[PDB]
Amino acid sequence: QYNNENNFV
């Protein structure tokens, strides 16, 4: 299982 998040502000 691969869990990620990416936020660019």
Q: How far apart are CA 9 and CA 1, in angstroms?
A: 27
For residue 4, give both structure tokens. 């990620």
Which two tokens mark 8? 């660019």
Q: How far apart are CA 8 and CA 1, in angstroms?
A: 24
Query: Integer distance in angstroms from the first to the last C-alpha of the chain?
Result: 27
Residue 7 tokens, joined = 């936020």
**CA distance linking residue 8 with residue 6, whole number of Å:** 7
